[PDB]
């Protein structure tokens, strides 16, 4: 890395089962200048302004009788207050109606993108989470990622 700026661009582990597990051990994935990946979270090495972003890709085939609530959130876990606060949040509800008894379950796809500039403190933890890993689609590269850059 030629830059002096704290960076991260972590990606979903394609081999992980029923979870969104962030990885830096892949090609085109970053973790430099103090940024750490500890308990599936990005650790802020120094105070400043950070551009924080994340994308998830949801997939399903057909629709169940139940309504599907799909969330994606980036949250801040402070070193001082110790509390978890949502910085960036989005929701999607893909299923208008239950797939008819004999109709072919046609595959649906729902991407979610979150991104913004935040003032963060040294030691702060950033979490990019989803509520339904059964709907998560990390089967191919570039589909689900989480990153930060000090500005």
């Amino acid at each position: 890395t030629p830059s002096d700026k704290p960076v991260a661009h972590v990606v979903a582990n394609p081999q992980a089962e029923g979870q969104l597990q962030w990885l830096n051990r892949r090609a085109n994935a970053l973790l430099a200048n103090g940024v750490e990946l500890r308990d599936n979270q990005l650790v802020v090495p120094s105070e400043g302004l950070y551009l924080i972003y994340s994308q998830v890709l949801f997939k399903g085939q057909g629709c169940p009788s139940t309504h599907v609530l799909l969330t994606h959130t980036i949250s801040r876990i402070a070193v001082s207050y110790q509390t978890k606060v949502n910085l960036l949040s989005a929701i999607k509800s893909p299923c208008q109606r239950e797939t008819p008894e004999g109709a072919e379950a046609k595959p649906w796809y729902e991407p979610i993108y979150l991104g913004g500039v935040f003032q963060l403190e040294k030691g702060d933890r950033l979490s990019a989470e989803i509520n339904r890993p059964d709907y998560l689609d990390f089967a191919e590269s570039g589909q689900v990622y989480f990153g930060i850059i000090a500005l």
Binding site: E17, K59, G60, Q61, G62, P64, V68, A105, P107, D134, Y135, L136, D137
Partner: peptide, 8 residues
């Protein structure tokens, strides 16, 4: 493996 909900 298949999830009954999603079919993933």
């Amino acid at each position: 493996r298949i999830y009954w909900s999603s079919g993933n």
